[PDB]
Design an enzyme around this catalytic site. Structure first.
Site, PDB file in Angstrom:
ATOM      1  CG  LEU A  24      -1.857  -1.263   1.246  1.00 41.16           C
ATOM      2  CD1 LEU A  24      -2.616  -1.141   2.552  1.00 41.16           C
ATOM      3  CD2 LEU A  24      -2.784  -1.414   0.046  1.00 41.16           C
ATOM      4  CG  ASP A  25       3.937   3.328  -2.928  1.00 36.77           C
ATOM      5  OD1 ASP A  25       4.140   4.400  -2.353  1.00 36.77           O
ATOM      6  OD2 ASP A  25       4.719   2.902  -3.780  1.00 36.77           O
ATOM      7  CB  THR A  26       0.366   7.346   0.205  1.00 37.73           C
ATOM      8  OG1 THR A  26       1.543   7.416   0.992  1.00 37.73           O
ATOM      9  CG2 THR A  26      -0.692   6.648   1.025  1.00 37.73           C
ATOM     10  CB  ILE A  85      -1.895  -0.932  -4.125  1.00 36.25           C
ATOM     11  CG1 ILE A  85      -1.800  -2.457  -4.073  1.00 36.25           C
ATOM     12  CG2 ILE A  85      -3.330  -0.478  -4.466  1.00 36.25           C
ATOM     13  CD1 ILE A  85      -1.903  -3.154  -5.423  1.00 36.25           C
ATOM     14  CG  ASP A 129       6.531   7.249  -0.481  1.00 34.88           C
ATOM     15  OD1 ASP A 129       5.854   6.229  -0.507  1.00 34.88           O
ATOM     16  OD2 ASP A 129       7.388   7.515  -1.317  1.00 34.88           O
TER      17      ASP A 129
END
Ligand SMILES: CC(C)[C@H](NC(=O)N(C)Cc1ccccn1)C(=O)N[C@@H](Cc1ccccc1)[C@H](O)[C@@H](O)[C@H](Cc1ccccc1)NC(=O)[C@@H](NC(=O)N(C)Cc1ccccn1)C(C)C
Length: 203
Positions: A24-26, A85, A129
């Site tokens: 899970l990657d902002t 993602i 991040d």
């Protein structure tokens, strides 16, 4: 649910009748998956990151289930070490960043999670991040001794200078931690400081 960032935010997706693990990657605009052979047609694309560009194949309207939530979007397939993602799918599953234990300031991912940081004693902006282990800033002068280090990402490895025990203010929150300085395209705040300022992912 809520995801803490003590660990890498890896989750099970399904993409086909297959479970996969993904991050899970902002800080990623896009979703990148490991090589697999999908039926369909694709467009060639080059994506960049820390250490350069790689070539990928772009598939449109792929359905994924992320944590029991459906999303439908563009996925890029290529020689990535990790399935990522990015915000194109995370926004569809209602994922936000929350500071202060939970709402709390709430940050949506419809745009890039850019905030102002104060680092001795300039203001910069940086990306929040959740996919990064470490915090990497542009080339600057910090007072103190450093040591050379190498870090990598998409595209490969960069040489950085490591400074330990540096004070940083992220949105008015103090953090005291390690900051890497080098030729990063973007200032990145990683999990090492994200956790200090009480950041979680929620959906
Ligand atoms: C996948 C790409 C499509 C993506 N690029 C991308 O989105 N853009 C270039 C567009 C853009 C421009 C400007 C701002 C934001 N977005 C990307 O690499 N994004 C980075 C952040 C970044 C953006 C722009 C330039 C440079 C970097 C990711 O969000 C970031 O979390 C990556 C993800 C990653 C992790 C492992 C392997 C590949 C990619 N971490 C990193 O690059 C860090 N490395 C790691 O943390 N590791 C390698 C450890 C690790 C191992 C396994 C799992 C996770 N982490 C660096 C910063 C230290």
């Amino acid at each position: 649910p809520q995801i803490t960032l003590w660990q890498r935010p890896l989750v099970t997706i399904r993409i086909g009748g297959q479970l996969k693990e993904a991050l899970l990657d902002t800080g990623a605009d896009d979703t990148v998956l490991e090589e697999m052979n999908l039926p369909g047609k694709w467009k060639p694309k080059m994506i960049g990151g820390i250490g350069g560009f790689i070539k990928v194949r772009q598939y449109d309207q792929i359905l994924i289930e992320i944590c029991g939530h459906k999303a439908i979007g563009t996925v890029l397939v290529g020689p990535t070490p990790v399935n990522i993602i990015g915000r194109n799918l995370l926004t569809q599953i209602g994922c936000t960043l929350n500071f202060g234990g939970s709402s709390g300031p709430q940050i949506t991912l419809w745009q890039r999670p850019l905030v102002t940081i104060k680092i001795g004693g300039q203001l910069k902006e940086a990306l929040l991040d959740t996919g990064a282990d470490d915090t990497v800033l542009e080339e600057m002068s910090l007072p103190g001794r450093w040591k050379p280090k190498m870090i990598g990402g998409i595209g490969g490895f960069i040489k950085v200078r490591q400074y330990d025990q540096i004070l940083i203010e992220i949105c008015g929150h103090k953090a005291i931690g390690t900051v890497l300085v080098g030729p990063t395209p973007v200032n990145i705040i990683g999990r090492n400081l994200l956790t200090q300022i009480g950041c979680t992912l929620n959906f």
